[model samples]
Target: AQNPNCNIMIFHPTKEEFNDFDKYIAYMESQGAHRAGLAKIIPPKEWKARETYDNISEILIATPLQQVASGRAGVFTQYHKKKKAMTVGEYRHLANSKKYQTPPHQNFEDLERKYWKNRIYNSPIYGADISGSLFDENTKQWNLGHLGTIQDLLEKECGVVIEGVNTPYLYFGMWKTTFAWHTEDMDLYSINYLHLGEPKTWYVVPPEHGQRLERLARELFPGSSRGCGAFLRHKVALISPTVLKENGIPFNRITQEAGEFMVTFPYGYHAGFNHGFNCAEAINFATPRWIDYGKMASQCSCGEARVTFSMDAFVRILQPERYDLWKRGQD
Candidate 1:
């Protein structure tokens, strides 16, 4: 393969051009995918400085997306990073910080002790209500990066191909020294439009690690790994644009992201991949094949996840009976 189009430093969506989100969402729906991702909303003035909108977005990522999906400092005092604040470096440090392992930062909802509450998914995913109404006030972050009309446009223009739920997910990670050699189906994907870097990906893995490289967001800076599993997976192995330079293994040529990325693998034993980087951002979406926890009978339909490593690992392959329960949130 050549090299990625390499649009990491490329400019973000322009304000005026991206304001028409309503039509965009309508478009996405026609394509047939469930909605997810940051919303382009203008928070009400009174609640802008408060936890209304801030609190909502945080919970969405931290809880279901399985990411701290936390926001970072704004322009970090300008000169501190030797450039503008909130750059890719900021994302790298945050995702890679093993010390910061927990739910979304300073959750006023107390997700750490109990639950982050299935609040954000209620409305934000649909672009119906963008107000920051259902949340407490004690916890708030000064980070300044939010979507506005862009969200509406996605809902209006883009279609979410969610055979499952992803606006929120269950996340996990391993330190740089740890190994994440794995492979997976091509149905999985994620958005990688922010800093702390671009994305790298590989196609094959060795038999020693015995794992598969599904989709993930990984942040790897000059030394450490920051960001999520989706990010990392792209950076380490993705060879897109098909004209740039290939990292090592031969990978598929990827161009754009799906409304909702999916992987076809039922479980383990997919790929043999192991590369580099540190903290990994893993958001897994699964459905239990049975109504509840029945005997591990493969005939039922869905399979169960190995919770020994993480209770929040798989989406639990849902059963038809309790599908709606998963649809609202498990969805």
Candidate 2:
């Protein structure tokens, strides 16, 4: 009942530019990998942010990996070095009461700001969405960044990428940290690049057999057949390819090294574990082919996400104009 929907695919550096949108379509056709991380997307050598990030003595870190394993911030059951997960105001309370740990830095608030921008080991600047939707504030802190050009362009030119769904997301991962299994929102495409890190291992299942796999899972794990959600509540589990193959389901596997990018297609359920510490960025892009999935996406959630985009409302709002644009492009 809880098996993932898609398989994983990995890509390495080649003559083809990973940044090129056309190359992605080509790779998806050939390799069928999703959730990519380009090894070359490192910060410029002169990035001053690193110095501040590295100098910080005590940094707020996530613990228990399982706290956010389900992909949503809960009560933050996990704690590191006695640090509690709470509001900014509460954080100050802990600091003042000497209950929380802190670096030599004078002001925790100021240091926190810098940490978000340039934290050591791993720092992820979130909200990379450029969809002109609610997610994107057009804030100075973040915009289309380097990893977003291609997908952002599509949203600007084509009406394909779902407004709130296909957008930029940032993350920082360390050992034992896991991104649980599930397909991209509404079964869209996702391209991920590791700005810096050791490496990530991915497990993916193809779409054709995805439904069948899910159906079979319900019978197998009937007690916890809720899929990603059920597993996330307590533990994280991944299906082995050998098991999948024996059961008539096939899977793709890869260990993405530093500087490589991975891509996953629509309905391809994927999950991976990060090694050492790594920083990665990803954004979703949808082509004309994604329309059908979008309709279903609005109603489906593997339980890994809190919000789902209303693609139907998106279509209605676009009026006939959305269809006209797509049709005109064909001409």
Alpha-carbon TM-score of each model against the true structure: 0.24, 0.52
Worst 10 residues of 1 by lDDT: 73-82
Which candidate number has the best lDDT?
A: 2
Candidate 1, which segments miss by more than 4 Å at Cα?
1-11, 20-165, 170-186, 192-248, 251-331
The residue ranges of model 2 lying beyond 4 angstroms of the native Cα positions read 1-19, 22-167, 226-237, 296-298, 301-305, 308-331
lDDT of 1 by residue, 1-331 (tens): 1112211111123334233433433333233221211111222223323332222223222121111111221100000011122322343344445543233434322331121122111111101101122312431321112322222322333342213223322211211111122222112222211111112222222212122222121221222123222222221222111211222322222211111112212222121111111111223222221112222211211121111122211223323444343234321
TM-score of 2: 0.52
Q: Please report, in order, the local distance difference test score of every candidate based on alpha carbons.
A: 0.22, 0.43
C-alpha lDDT of residue 190 in model 1? 21
Q: Taking the tens digit of each residue's C-alpha lDDT, what string does model 2 give over 245-315?
A: 66876566566655444666677666655543555556766665555665444222243333324434343
